[PDB]
Every structure is written in C-alpha cells, then in structure tokens.
Design a binder for this molecule. Sequence first.
Ligand SMILES: Nc1ncnc2c1ncn2[C@@H]1O[C@H](COP(=O)(O)OP(=O)(O)O)[C@@H](O)[C@H]1O
Ligand SMILES: Nc1ncnc2c1ncn2[C@@H]1O[C@H](COP(=O)(O)OP(=O)(O)O)[C@@H](O)[C@H]1O
Ligand SMILES: Cc1cn([C@H]2C[C@H](O)[C@@H](COP(=O)(O)O)O2)c(=O)[nH]c1=O
Ligand SMILES: Cc1cn([C@H]2C[C@H](O)[C@@H](COP(=O)(O)O)O2)c(=O)[nH]c1=O
Ligand SMILES: [Mg+2]
Ligand SMILES: [Mg+2]
Lengths: 208, 209
Amino acid sequence: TGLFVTLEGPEGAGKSTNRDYLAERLRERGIEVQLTREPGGTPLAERIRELLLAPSDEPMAADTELLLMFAARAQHLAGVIRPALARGAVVLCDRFTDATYAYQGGGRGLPEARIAALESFVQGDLRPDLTLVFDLPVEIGLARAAARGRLDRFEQEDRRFFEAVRQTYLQRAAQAPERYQVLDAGLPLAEVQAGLDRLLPNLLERLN
Amino acid sequence: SNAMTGLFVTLEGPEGAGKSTNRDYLAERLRERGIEVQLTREPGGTPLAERIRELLLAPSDEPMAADTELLLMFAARAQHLAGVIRPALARGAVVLCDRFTDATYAYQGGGRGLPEARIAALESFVQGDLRPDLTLVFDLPVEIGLARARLDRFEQEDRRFFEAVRQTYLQRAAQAPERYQVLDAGLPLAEVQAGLDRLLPNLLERLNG
Ligand SMILES: Nc1ncnc2c1ncn2[C@@H]1O[C@H](COP(=O)(O)OP(=O)(O)O)[C@@H](O)[C@H]1O
Ligand SMILES: Nc1ncnc2c1ncn2[C@@H]1O[C@H](COP(=O)(O)OP(=O)(O)O)[C@@H](O)[C@H]1O
Ligand SMILES: Cc1cn([C@H]2C[C@H](O)[C@@H](COP(=O)(O)O)O2)c(=O)[nH]c1=O
Ligand SMILES: Cc1cn([C@H]2C[C@H](O)[C@@H](COP(=O)(O)O)O2)c(=O)[nH]c1=O
Ligand SMILES: [Mg+2]
Ligand SMILES: [Mg+2]
C-alpha cells in the first residue's frame, strides 16, 4: 500500500539534495518515508557498489557492470524496497533502473533489449509509481558536483558518455509521461523545490 | 599471438570430490606433453571476479537473496570469460576451469530451487553459444566428499542441498553425454587419476579436432 518514487538525472542535478527535501515535506505531513539509493541500500549491496565504483587497471566488461548493477538491485529490492512498500511506506530511492538504461544503455551502448531482459528478470512487473528526472546540461551538473580526489569509474568518463546518459533519461520520460515528471534542474534550487512543492498534491493522490 | 583453436574443459562435482586436486593433476600431465594450459576457477579467475567470489562465499548476518547470488555468479563469469577464457581459447590454450555453469545449475538450480529456465536464460545472455568442449564430473556419495572437506556460505548447507547438487550434475551429464565424462571420485585418488590418464587421448583428440 506504499508508493515507490525514484529520483534520476545526470551527476550534480540535485537528486540527493531533493530526495531529502521531499522527505521532509512528506514527513512533516505525518507520512512514513524510507530513503534509499542505488547501487547500494543494504550492506551487501553497498559492497557491490564499491566494486562498481572503484577504479582498476583491469577493465570491467560491460556485461559484468550490468549484471553487478542488477545483482545489487535484487538484494536491495528484497531487503529494503519490497518490505517498505509492504509496510505502506513511501520509498524515495536515489536512482533505479532508469539509470541502468541511461548509463549501461546510453553510456555503454548495451542494447536496450538486454537491459529490459534483466529488468524483467529482477523486478518482474514492479516499476516505480513516479520517477522524478532532474534534467540539466551535463557540464552544469559536473561543475556543481565538483569531484575531488580519485575519480570513480563513472566520473572517469567523457562528455559524450554523460550526454548519452542525459538524453536517454529524456527519451524514456517522453515515452511514458504518466510515470515521469521532468524538472529543470538548471533552475535555482528554490525554483526546483517550488516545482516539487507543486507535485505534492498528486504524489499524495497516487499514495492514497 | 597464435590464432588456433584451443579446448575448454571444466571440472565439476560435489564438495570434496577432488576437482581442484585433479585440475592441477591434468595441468601437470598436459604440461609434460608440452601443451599450453590456462588454469582457472569459478567464481573468480580475475581480480574483479575474485572480489565477487569473496562476496559469494563469506558468511554474513544479512541473508543473500537467491537472485542476487545467481546474478553475482554470472557477473563473475562474464568478467572471467572476457578477461581469461576467451583469450585463452583464441590462442589455442587448453583451459582447465575448476567449476563453471554446470555448478550454477546444480547449486542455484538444484540446491536453491531457482527455475532451470532462469539459469538457462542467463547462460545464453552471458555466454552466447559458448559451452565447454568437455566437462569432467567427479561424482561420489556426498558424505564421502564432505568427510574429506571454518565453512563458507555453501559449505553451511544441509545434506539435501548437497544431494540436489550431486543429482543435478548427474542429470545434466546423462542428458548430454557427448560433452560430459563422469568419473567415480569415490575411488582412491591414484585410481581417479588413472582414469584421467585413460581419457587424456580423447581430450587431445578434441583439442586436435
Ligand atoms: N538547482 C540547483 N541550483 C544550484 N545548486 C544546486 C541545485 N541542485 C543541487 N545543487 C547543488 O549541487 C550539488 C550537487 O547536488 P546533489 O544533490 O549531490 O546531486 P546528485 O545527487 O544529483 O549528484 C550540491 O552542492 C547541491 O547543493
Ligand atoms: N579420490 C580421492 N581420494 C581421497 N582423497 C581425495 C580424493 N580426491 C581428493 N582428495 C582429498 O580431498 C580433499 C579435497 O580435495 P579438493 O581437490 O580440494 O576437492 P574439491 O576441490 O572438489 O572440493 C583434499 O585433501 C584432497 O587431497
Ligand atoms: C543505479 C545506477 C547507477 N549508476 C551509476 C551512476 C552513478 O555514476 C553511480 C552512482 O553514483 P551516485 O550515488 O552519486 O548517484 O552509479 C549506473 O551506472 N547504473 C545504475 O543502474
Ligand atoms: C561456479 C559456481 C560455484 N558455486 C559454489 C560451489 C562451491 O561451494 C563454491 C566455490 O567453492 P569451491 O572453490 O570449493 O569450488 O561456489 C555455485 O554455487 N555456483 C556456481 O556457479
Ligand atoms: Mg547523489
Ligand atoms: Mg576446490
């Protein structure tokens, strides 16, 4: 009886920031909210995250990257997301399978059909009830993120990779607007959050 | 490098059957004949695949979902295939691989109860049409193997789990006998190894063919 909401977008778009904003808006209204993120969300899934992000002189096969992302997702679904939904909680999840389509499909060039096969394999028919896409020019997000220290495997990638990621998110949202809301994350944060405030009534609608 | 066909041999069987011992025995016999061998094992075989092995085998208070276990096994396999197995086959090596996808059917299918069709789907997903040229099944009563063998996640399972493992290997071998050889791993090691000596000419025939 819960509601599954995911947050998506390029690096530095404001996913993590706005996850916490939405959580407070919901919690102050007396709603139980479970916050989580991918890859990760459980101790084992966090170990898989570490493998996915750590640079190595050994190149990771694209299939390995895809399978690890879905292995972490399977564990996270079983351990956190499904139990929260069964409790009737709102789950706010920072990244989910749209990120796999964007990064592994758009970025890595893996066929959409292969990603879809694993989506069905891991999730069955489970999909987010609502996905918020925080869209902006990738360089603006990269500048906000201001990566410091050793870059992780995805931070190592070039602009073409991240542009493909961005465009894949937009393409997927355009094909199923009933499930997606695209926010202009290039707006000042106060304006992005006003946009979120305006979606609140509907979110509650889907929820109840 | 050299561009000739190699041979993909896998070794399978219940816990303590003698897979690892006999992989090394075969390696020594082939190297005595001056044949290039690539030794490897699963899950593992590359730095990343070995980190995945660590997650698969280490006990934890957090239950690992069966789907997670299956996907991790195949993620390690994808990396291993790309990094070690395919290149070895392309340069004409005999790959001697301690466990491969038959173990997935046996442990994740027989043991865990995951549907065979789901494992088959991932097999095709990860391997395309690639299968071992020869799979050696070291078969014996599970209690004998266990009495040979701190325990990892799989070693902690019960006897019915291990019987399912054993029987799954035998079933798969019976269905595709052109690809499998079942050895009686309950014999003394020297007799198991005499059996391996006896099959070496056929192994070499597959390598040359
Ligand atoms: N609309 C915005 N305008 C200006 N700065 C923002 C905006 N959204 C987020 N930021 C800032 O950008 C940085 C990255 O935000 P973050 O939520 O970590 O992004 P993500 O999780 O999408 O990578 C943070 O310092 C955050 O305060
Ligand atoms: N046929 C055999 N008879 C007696 N002992 C054996 C035999 N095969 C292996 N062993 C011993 O049993 C133990 C497990 O062998 P190992 O090769 O590690 O098995 P596996 O890799 O199949 O678990 C080792 O101590 C090994 O020397
Ligand atoms: C969830 C998910 C994340 N990723 C990447 C996006 C990010 O670069 C990284 C996670 O970083 P993040 O926690 O800051 O969002 O993992 C994928 O490539 N595929 C996926 O399915
Ligand atoms: C290769 C593989 C191994 N396993 C298990 C069998 C063993 O208990 C364990 C590997 O340990 P081992 O080195 O002794 O063979 O992994 C699976 O469950 N599925 C697989 O696909
Ligand atoms: Mg973030
Ligand atoms: Mg062994």
